[PDB]
């Protein structure tokens, strides 16, 4: 079985060929980082930064998102939310629309969960994520979000573009720790709690557009 | 209405005369701590220690618990829990049997919530609790519990006896932070998360009996 009615059939080939898809899409340092040889960075307290995604997978995801076209989001109300009122609006394409929610959940249960288990001892993971989407911020379409927390036990933020080369600006601004990650990594991702002890704030971008893929796990 | 069917009937008068209950049960330093002039201690990151109640309230609670008599708990399974199985057995009596569970919830909603809002900015609290019991720790009856996490957003620990003079032992040890509670205060209370970033193991009591207050807030 191979879905030929798609731009990148190899993106969904994780189910049919997990070994080949993992080798082609995951970061080269993902195994090294998981083995416990440094790699993971903690610029802020109770924070992490490890290489997860590769250039090819990021390019394929960006191409699929661009081909989707309907970049909804940016309204106070929410059509995909049961409550019907989103506290924070953002222009993004949900993983449900692209059909990659199942594949993303499988990848999180496979690779993301072991990293959380190793980083946090005594913590068991089930990889339950209710919100998963990729947001693209533009200098005139979507500005930096207001300082708000996350309604989940852990939050993962994965960049999809090179800093400066693709978009000019900054990253996050942790008010509690007085820390700003102004050097985002395209291949690396951060996984830190955001429920109570993290009031996250995003910095603005001047030139270009930066794509961020963030999912709310354990909600 | 003043029901005299109690050893200390004034313990249930939290709602009849709130001013009297506050002036005769809460700690005198609680107002100063809420005013934001120190008092609150931060022995470890994301950990708080501030006075909560007065000595008279603790003595009355201890006397009522002693008069209760039914200090059950100690088996892997349980009958109070809906599931019927307890992850960590402990000899404690829930306030539902005592009947002051509503009073404890009212006290939490009246004093605890605003302090949590002041301590952790940007977090809205409703003071919802389900699991709350007073556990008496004795070396010959119930030793220290193995390290585990808390099935709640926040965990509140309040001492109910004068350490040293009433019991000999230890407090808690933070496995991930190397934080050890060596000199707990009878009036002071412990406030820290126990879900993901904090795994705690209690120290073993040696002499006397140690009485502690446990309450699962926001589960």
From Swiss-Prot, chains A, B:
Q: Which residues bind Fe cation?
A: 148, 150, 200
- The organism's superkingdom is given as Eukaryota
Report the outcome of residue 153 to N: Loss of dimerization. Loss of lysyl hydroxylase activity and decreased glycosyltransferase activity
Give compartment(s): Rough endoplasmic reticulum; Endoplasmic reticulum lumen; Endoplasmic reticulum membrane; Secreted
**Fe2OG dioxygenase domain: from which residue to which, for each copy?**
128-219
Binding-site residues, 2-oxoglutarate? 80, 137, 157, 210
Effect on the protein upon substituting residue 150 to A: Strongly decreased lysyl hydroxylase activity. No effect on glycosyltransferase activity
In which tissues or organs does this protein occur? Ubiquitous. Detected in heart, placenta and pancreas and at lower levels in lung, liver and skeletal muscle.
Q: What is known of its domains?
A: The N-terminal domain mediates glycosyltransferase activity. The C-terminal domain that mediates lysyl hydroxylase activity is also important for homodimerization.
Q: Subunit comment for this entry?
A: Homodimer.
What is the protein's given name? Multifunctional procollagen lysine hydroxylase and glycosyltransferase LH3
């Amino acid at each position: 079985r191979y879905d030929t009615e798609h731009l990148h059939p190899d993106l969904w080939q994780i189910f049919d060929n997990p070994v080949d898809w993992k080798e082609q899409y995951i970061h080269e340092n993902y195994s090294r980082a998981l083995e416990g040889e440094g790699i993971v960075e903690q610029p802020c307290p109770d924070v992490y930064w490890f290489p997860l995604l590769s250039e090819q997978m990021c390019d394929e995801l960006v191409a699929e998102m661009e081909h989707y076209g309907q970049w909804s989001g940016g309204r106070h109300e929410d059509s995909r939310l049961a409550g019907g009122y989103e506290n924070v609006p953002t222009v993004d394409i949900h993983m449900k629309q692209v059909g990659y929610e199942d594949q993303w959940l499988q990848l999180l249960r496979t690779y993301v969960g072991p990293m959380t288990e190793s980083l946090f001892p005594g913590y068991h993971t089930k990889a339950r994520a209710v919100m998963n989407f990729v947001v693209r911020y533009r200098p005139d379409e979507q500005p930096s979000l207001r300082p708000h927390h996350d309604s989940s036990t852990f939050t993962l933020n994965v960049a999809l573009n090179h800093k400066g080369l693709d978009y000019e600006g900054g990253g996050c601004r942790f008010l509690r720790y007085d820390c700003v990650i102004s050097s985002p990594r395209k291949g690396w991702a951060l996984l830190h709690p955001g429920r109570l002890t993290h009031y996250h704030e995003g910095l603005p971008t001047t030139w270009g557009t930066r794509y961020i893929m963030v999912s709310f796990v354990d909600p």
